[PDB]
Amino acid sequence: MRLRRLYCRTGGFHLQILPDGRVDGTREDNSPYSLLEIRAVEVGVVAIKGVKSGRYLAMNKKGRLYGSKHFTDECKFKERLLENGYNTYSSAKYRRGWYVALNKNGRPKKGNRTRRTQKATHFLPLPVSG
Numbered sequence: 739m740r741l742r743r744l745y746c747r748t749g750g751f752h753l754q755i756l757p758d759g760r761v762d763g764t765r766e767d768n769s770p771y772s773l774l775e776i777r778a779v780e781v782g783v784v785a786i787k788g789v790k791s792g793r794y795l796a797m798n799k800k801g802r803l804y805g806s807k808h809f810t811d812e813c814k815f816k817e818r819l820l821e822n823g824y825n826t827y828s829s830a831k832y833r834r835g836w837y838v839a840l841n842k843n844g845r846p847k848k849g850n851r852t853r854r855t856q857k858a859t860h861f862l863p864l865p866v867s868g
């Protein structure tokens with residue numbers, strides 16, 4: 739059950755870390771690039787690794803999500819548990835309120851267009867066959 743998928747509150751998507759470095763949402767169940775290793779690397783901070791791509795979820799200085807080729811400081815996300823049961827993930831490196839988020843088309847949002855009150859930033863990590 740150690741592997742997880744990250745389900746968005748909106749759109750019926752779960753997060754995918756694709757082998758070309760892109761990040762998006764998919765609504766398909768048999769999506770190997772959506773299988774994630776979510777590990778706390780500091781108190782309140784996680785790394786999210788796409789196990790099949792080998793890439794870490796990352797956010798660059800422009801607020802854009804990508805799948806990193808190795809683990810860097812751009813791969814750290816502050817994880818907050820909301821009272822509604824979902825979690826938010828915000829850039830630990832760029833402390834500007836920049837969240838992991840998917841729009842209505844399943845495409846990642848630019849960090850400066852996100853806020854913790856947006857349902858697009860709300861995700862549920864769920865163990866796979868847990």
Ligand SMILES: [Cl-]
Pocket residue numbers: 846847848851
């Ligand atoms: Cl956007």
Ligand code: NA
Pocket residue numbers: 743766767768769770772
């Ligand atoms: Na899947």
